[PDB]
Design a protein around this ligand. Structure first.
Ligand SMILES: [K+]
Ligand SMILES: [K+]
Ligand SMILES: [K+]
Ligand SMILES: [K+]
Ligand SMILES: [K+]
Ligand SMILES: [K+]
Ligand SMILES: [K+]
Ligand SMILES: [K+]
Ligand SMILES: [K+]
Ligand SMILES: [K+]
Ligand SMILES: [K+]
Ligand SMILES: [K+]
Ligand SMILES: [K+]
Ligand SMILES: [Mg+2]
Ligand SMILES: [Mg+2]
Length: 1304
RNA sequence: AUAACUCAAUUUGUAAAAAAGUUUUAGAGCUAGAAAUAGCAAGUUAAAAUAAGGCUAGUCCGUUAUCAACUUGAAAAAGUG
DNA sequence: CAATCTCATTTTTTACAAATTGAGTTAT
DNA sequence: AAATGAGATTG
């Protein structure tokens, strides 16, 4: 009888029901409720609208930040608990004054001065220590016994803000000249014939200067005569500067040697480069690393370490002193030269002067930006110098302090404890505890320290003690926890679901991969009559000789080093591999480098051991735990080898277990899978073959909720929301249809700036390019496609090997690498900037061989810098493979209309498995319902071909129309070409033919291209399509004025309110930040979020007399009030002032609750206090199509013939608005503007008319520009009128309703 | 369509950390002058909170997902035109 | 009242698993 | 990232 169309989207699911002849039925549905209507007629087309499903990310960031706060608090509490007994003797209330510091004097138990509890001592303190860093320095340097409260405050300050953990081990700050002299000296021992002269260069001043790395490099090698920044020494300095140099051209290497000191891979990149150039060069590179460390410290410390043990605190004190001197000076200067402007600068808090800087909301950047012109227009020079150094007037608590390692704060903490433990015994006894408070960190592989109540926690306990930083190693089981961390995410082997998958870098796994590949190699020589498999002997030979010697095995090496040497073939042809083997024994060679014993690796009796070792290296990344894991193998290798094995670390897991590979045996053979891969006789059988082979027993040994299911698919939670919604829609429609299932179901599914600036900064830096200095950019500017490409191509044409001009981009071209006709790709992977696309070569193909020849090296540079990806590069270069084959072309064309996306396949599988539940007499599935999946293009092209057009901004009907067209087209296709079921339906020379076929597949809808009016299916002679009437039905359907558009009603969740903390002020609006913090005193939160609104019919007290007055009103229940409201709603409402609440008239009203007022006017609930537009403007099709054609030959003369349609459209919009919108000022502005601009071209007026439909669009009001006239939105900020209106509760389809007239 | 492998890009989910920001309070303002109001001196730091909070009391949990109405369920979801 | 204008926490690092897409080798 | 609910001031 019927089929179902579905259009799945992130914010929408369109749906339609169609009959044999592609009509959409209309049915009468019962209405419920207290109203006049008992029924309504509904068309079976419609669409469901919903807010986007959100990722878990924000929730995650919040949760983890929460944990950070409570653990930081616990740190302080540990400290205070160590100080408690001895502080009670010094100061009874000290810690109490601290914890009540936030309270106003009125609420304080103790005196208002936190530290010493009296004004004179407090003032004295601040006068002696204007910043906490003064106290830090003096407490690190001094020998004097110190007041215990100041000791506490300094330790607490270092523990509360402890700096980061990104550097392992400890630092003992270093005092760059000596390390530079060092670099020069080892370099000079390595090159005896050309020395470099230390010369009396100042290495400290030049390398620690505030400039960029490249400029310090250039300055440094300026002082070096005849040395070039690209020479070896220059590259070593650059390396030490954190940069990424390339040492290949120093050493005559054909392979890029590039060392970035940050990347974890360094020691291995050094290991291989060193491996080529000799190991007499290791001294040099370690030297460069030392100089890197000291140069990195020189950013923060900025002070000679001879004066103090507290270089950080000392450099903060330095910031303070120069702030003071420069401020005295600046004030003087403004007095003299610009006294008028003194006020604004040092007083007005709103101006971003020094007053806005200290007392206001102006940042360092905004302050600098404000006074730049005030400095350079005076006579001041050095203050500007400090401003470009960003050193000018610096606070000590700053955005850039995130560089500070915790090791320096630890240095100061340890110094203080050593100083004052002499005077205070408990500091000696507890010194280590305290250091460990600062030092200890929960390992990421442990996770939350939980007892049973955390859904997020995997960690296991070695003992039941409460965990502390001091007992952590003893109480927490770290090996088990670290193991669960990975194993709870890792795949089991699907063939042996109870078996863990092997490490990707496991030796056995790599033998399996190499042999699996090798087994299908075939060879022919002159004599032999056919290509033959390798035998077991030949494979073992190739493995021992090539795979166990060379890290990668090329086809050339297979030919020369095996077939020539061993088998004496001067020529051979290899059929199973291309240019080199994909599989390799990498771990074999890694271990060979480390353990230096090949007999050990080749000996079967060590297999287990080696497996275990690699498992450890894979399963743990913590070097201490790795060591403890390898102790048992301590005896087997020299302590140095254990030192190197320690550092070897791998990541990743395979697809297969060890039992599957080498464990199971075939009953007849007794051979494992790998035994067969090694020797199978004549047949050389694949893993796939072994697994599916009925003569072998491997196969039989192997053969041994909707919402969760959807949540488990891989895909954006956004699209998943629409997937679940789509299933619920189908359920409801099947119910609507009498519990009869559809004949078909046709589903179609819809398809920064900081990341960009990052890509370009890194790629450019790699490339060594100046284009950033020469042409500075800002993140937002990179939203421009042409400019982003410009910076990714390094200012160069991508095809022509010439420079491009930044001012000239408007004259340049963005070209598609593989043409858009074949591949619809809008991304930067398929796009390129060139001055003219004509220089790509032929239009029909990949860029020409000429262009590949000329540009391939440059594209290689870009690839290495990662300014282009691999995919881009391989597509760009494909012409040297023959470019696009005709078969490739046909592939693209059919991929345009046939849906390959895995997520959509999952949708079809869900629907197919819910619809088809029965099996036939052979125990095979009965498909009563065919699930068809189409790509958007089909309905798009159809729409364009037959002039059923689409303008999204008129209303939401187009989602539902799209679903209808999906059902019509999708049913027509399979009706016409039933064989294409295999492509389009879920479940189980010639290239040119395929190309023409899938390119023309849709022509059976057309009369002439010449085809008959009536199309049929040749085999059954059934009528699929009749050009005379069927199209007419399509038009009638699109025209239908009543389409069910349902905005899903949803309880709002998430944040309680906006996060900002406003200053104290008298408003009942401010929300307390803590139970007892009265916002009138303390400030608080504004703008809570309504979870849902409740209808209340009750009485409220009135006036001094408290006369009870009956009310009906709408009360927003905030997310924060929700649980309290639901626990006991009556007590909650009574605490709000409502009395004699009528409990059964309470109506829950989530966001977007729908109401109908007079004249069919509708409203949706935005909140308790605001409304959204609830009506759709159904614009007759003739106007939709006219608008489409006008805003974009015969169609032009239609437009010019129908120009009066503009006035008619304005009259539709205005009629609609006067009945429904009820914004009079804005409507008059619209009419005024439209009547202004009618001298404009008809295209322009069409486009901007299309702008006008946001006035009439459903949902939240929004602003729109007509031409240059902006129309500000009109919000509906009263809900009063709803309380007497008719509320409409709707089904998911909107076909079932219950309507409540609210009078009560 | 599936499986293993190579290379790469993307997405989702989790954990452990850092720097700021804000908010109240504390950093004795000074002279005039009744009064506001002037004149000048000043400023860089800290404590504490950072979803209200919860019981399960953990160095845990608290912003994702899921939700018409009615009858039924504690929930999923079931039953209703 | 409504018309108008304004506001909205930000950023950084480390470690890890899984799909998925898409260019390739081999198989069911 | 906007966009959209609502805070703040003005007509
Ligand atoms: K008091
Ligand atoms: K030089
Ligand atoms: K401020
Ligand atoms: K500021
Ligand atoms: K601050
Ligand atoms: K290959
Ligand atoms: K590892
Ligand atoms: K040993
Ligand atoms: K939600
Ligand atoms: K939301
Ligand atoms: K990630
Ligand atoms: K609903
Ligand atoms: K908002
Ligand atoms: Mg808290
Ligand atoms: Mg602060």
């Amino acid at each position: 009888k019927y089929s179902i169309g579905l259009a799945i989207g992130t914010n929408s699911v369109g749906w339609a029901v169609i009959t044999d002849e592609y009509k959409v039925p209309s049915k009468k549905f019962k209405v419920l409720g207290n109203t006049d209507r008992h029924s309504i007629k509904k068309n079976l087309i419609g669409a469901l609208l919903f807010d986007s499903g959100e990722t878990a990310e924000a929730t995650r960031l919040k949760r983890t930040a929460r944990r950070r706060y409570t653990r930081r608090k616990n740190r302080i509490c540990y400290l205070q608990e160590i100080f408690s007994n001895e502080m009670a003797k010094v100061d009874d209330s000290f810690f109490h004054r601290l914890e009540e510091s936030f309270l106003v004097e009125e609420d304080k138990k103790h005196e208002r001065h936190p530290i010493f509890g009296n004004i004179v001592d407090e003032v004295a303190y601040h006068e002696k220590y204007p910043t906490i860093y003064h106290l830090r320095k003096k407490l690190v340097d001094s020998t004097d016994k110190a007041d215990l409260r100041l000791i506490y405050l300094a330790l607490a300050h270092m523990i509360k803000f402890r700096g980061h953990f990104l550097i392992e081990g400890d630092l003992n700050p270093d005092s760059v000249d000596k390390l530079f002299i060092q670099l020069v000296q080892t370099y000079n021992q390595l090159f005896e014939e050309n020395p470099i002269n230390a010369s009396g260069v100042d290495a400290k001043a030049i390398l620690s200067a505030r400039l960029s790395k490249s400029r310090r490099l250039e300055n440094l090698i300026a002082q070096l005569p005849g040395e070039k920044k690209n020479g070896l020494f220059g590259n070593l300095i650059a390396l030490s500067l954190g940069l990424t140099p390339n040492f290949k051209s120093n050493f005559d290497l054909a392979e890029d040697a590039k060392l970035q000191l940050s990347k974890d891979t360094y020691d291995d990149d050094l290991d291989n480069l060193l491996a080529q150039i000799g190991d007499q060069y290791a001294d040099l590179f370690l030297a460069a690393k030392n100089l890197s460390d000291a140069i990195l410290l020189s950013d923060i410390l900025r002070v000679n370490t001879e004066i103090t043990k507290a270089p950080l605190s000392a450099s903060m004190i330095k910031r303070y002193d120069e702030h003071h001197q420069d401020l005295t000076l600046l004030k003087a200067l403004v007095r003299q030269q610009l006294p008028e402007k003194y006020k604004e600068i040092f007083f007005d808090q709103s101006k971003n002067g020094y007053a806005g800087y200290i007392d206001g909301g102006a940042s360092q950047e905004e302050f600098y930006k404000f006074i730049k012109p005030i400095l350079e227009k005076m006579d001041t020079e050095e203050l500007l110098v400090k401003l470009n150094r960003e050193d000018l007037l610096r606070k000590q608590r700053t955005f850039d302090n995130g560089s500070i390692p915790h090791q320096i704060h630890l240095g100061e903490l340890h110094a203080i404890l050593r100083r004052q433990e002499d005077f205070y015994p408990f500091l000696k006894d507890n010194r280590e505890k305290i250091e460990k408070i600062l030092t200890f960190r929960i390992p990421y592989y442990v996770g939350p320290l939980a007892r049973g109540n955390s859904r997020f926690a995997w960690m296991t306990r070695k003992s039941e003690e409460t965990i502390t930083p001091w007992n952590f190693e003893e109480v927490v089981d770290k090996g088990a926890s670290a193991q669960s961390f990975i194993e709870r995410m890792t795949n089991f082997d699907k063939n042996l679901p109870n078996e863990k998958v092997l490490p990707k870098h496991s030796l056995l796994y790599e033998y399996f991969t190499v042999y699996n590949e090798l087994t299908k190699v075939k060879y022919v020589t002159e004599g032999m009559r056919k290509p033959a498999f390798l035998s077991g002997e030949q494979k073992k030979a190739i493995v021992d000789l090539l795979f166990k010697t060379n890290r990668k095995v090329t086809v050339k090496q297979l030919k020369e080093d095996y077939f020539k040497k061993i088998e004496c073939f001067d020529s051979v042809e290899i059929s199973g591999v291309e240019d080199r083997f994909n599989a390799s024994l990498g771990t074999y060679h890694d271990l060979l480098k480390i353990i230096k014993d090949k007999d050990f690796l080749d000996n079967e009796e060590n297999e287990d051991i080696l497996e275990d070792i690699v498992l450890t290296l894979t399963l743990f990344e913590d070097r201490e735990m790795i060591e403890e894991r390898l102790k048992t193998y301590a005896h087997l290798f020299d302590d140095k080898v254990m030192k190197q094995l320690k550092r070897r670390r791998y990541t990743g897991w395979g697809r297969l277990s060890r039992k599957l590979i080498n464990g199971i045996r075939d009953k007849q053979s007794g051979k494992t899978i790998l035994d067969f891969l090694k020797s199978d006789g004549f047949a050389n059988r694949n893993f796939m073959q072994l697994i599916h082979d009925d003569s072998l027993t491997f196969k039989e040994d192997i053969q041994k909720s909707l919402h969760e299911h959807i949540a488990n698919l891989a895909g954006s939670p956004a699209i998943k929301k629409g997937i679940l919604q789509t299933v619920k829609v189908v359920d409801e429609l099947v119910k609507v249809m009498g519990r009869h299932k559809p004949e078909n179901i046709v589903i179609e599914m819809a398809r920064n700036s900081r990341e960009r600036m990052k890509r370009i900064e890194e790629g450019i830096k790699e490339l060594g390019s100046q284009i950033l200095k020469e042409h500075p950019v800002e993140n937002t500017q990179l939203q421009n496609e042409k400019l982003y490409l410009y910076y990714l191509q390094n200012g160069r044409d991508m095809y022509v090997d010439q420079e491009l001009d930044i001012n000239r981009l408007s004259d340049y071209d963005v070209d598609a690498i593989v043409p858009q006709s074949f591949l619809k790709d809008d991304s930067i992977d398929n796009k390129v900037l060139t001055r003219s696309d004509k220089n790509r070569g032929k239009s029909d193909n990949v860029p020409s061989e000429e262009v590949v020849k000329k540009m391939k090296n440059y594209w290689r540079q870009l690839l290495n810098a990662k300014l282009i990806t691999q995919r881009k590069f391989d597509n760009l270069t494909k012409a040297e493979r023959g470019g696009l084959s005709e078969l490739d072309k046909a592939g693209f064309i059919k991929r345009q209309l046939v849906e390959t996306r895995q997520i959509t396949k999952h949708v079809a599988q869900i629907l197919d498995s819910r619809m088809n539940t029965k099996y036939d007499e052979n125990d095979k599935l009965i498909r009563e319902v065919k699930v068809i999946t189409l790509k958007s293009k089909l309905v798009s092209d159809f729409r364009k071909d037959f002039q059923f057009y689409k303008v999204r901004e008129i209303n939401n009907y187009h989602h539902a129309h799209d679903a209808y067209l999906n059902a019509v087209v999708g049913t027509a296709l399979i009706k016409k070409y039933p064989k294409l079921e295999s492509e389009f339906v879920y479940g189980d020379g010639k290239a040119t033919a395929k190309y023409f076929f899938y390119s023309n597949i849709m022509n059976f809808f057309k009369t002439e291209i010449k085809r008959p009016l009536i199309e049929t299916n040749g085999e059954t002679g059934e009528i699929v399509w009749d050009k005379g009437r069927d199209f007419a039905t399509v038009r009638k359907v699109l025209s239908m004025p009543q389409v069910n558009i349902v905005k899903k009603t949803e309880v709002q969740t998430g944040g309680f309110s906006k996060e900002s903390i406003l200053p104290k002020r008298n408003s009942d609006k401010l929300i307390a930040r803590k139970k007892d913090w009265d916002p009138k005193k303390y400030g608080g939160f504004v703008s809570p979020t309504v979870a849902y609104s409740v209808l209340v019919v009750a009485k409220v007290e009135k006036g001094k007399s408290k006369k009870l007055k009956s009310v009906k009103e709408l009360l927003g229940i905030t997310i924060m009030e929700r649980s309290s409201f639901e626990k006991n709603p009556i007590d909650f409402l009574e605490a709000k002032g409502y009395k004699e609440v009528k409990k059964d008239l309470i109506i829950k009203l989530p966001k977007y609750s729908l109401f109908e007022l007079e004249n069919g006017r509708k409203r949706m609930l935005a909140s308790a206090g605001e409304l959204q537009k609830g009506n759709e403007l159904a614009l007759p099709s003739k106007y939709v199509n006219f608008l489409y054609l006008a805003s974009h030959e015969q169609k032009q003369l239609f437009v010019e013939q129908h120009k009066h349609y503009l006035d008619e459209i304005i009259e539709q919009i205005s009629e609609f608005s006067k009945r429904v919108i009820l914004a009079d000022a804005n409507l008059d502005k619209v009419l005024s503007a439209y009547n202004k601009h009618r001298d404009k071209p008809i295209r322009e007026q069409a486009e901007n008319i299309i702008h006008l439909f946001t006035l009439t669009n459903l949902g939240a009001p929004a602003a729109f520009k007509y031409f240059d006239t902006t129309i500000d939105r009109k919000q509906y900020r009263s809900t009063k009128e709803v309380l007497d209106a008719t509320l409409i509760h709707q089904s998911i389809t909107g076909l079932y309703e219950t309507r409540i007239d609210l009078s009560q």
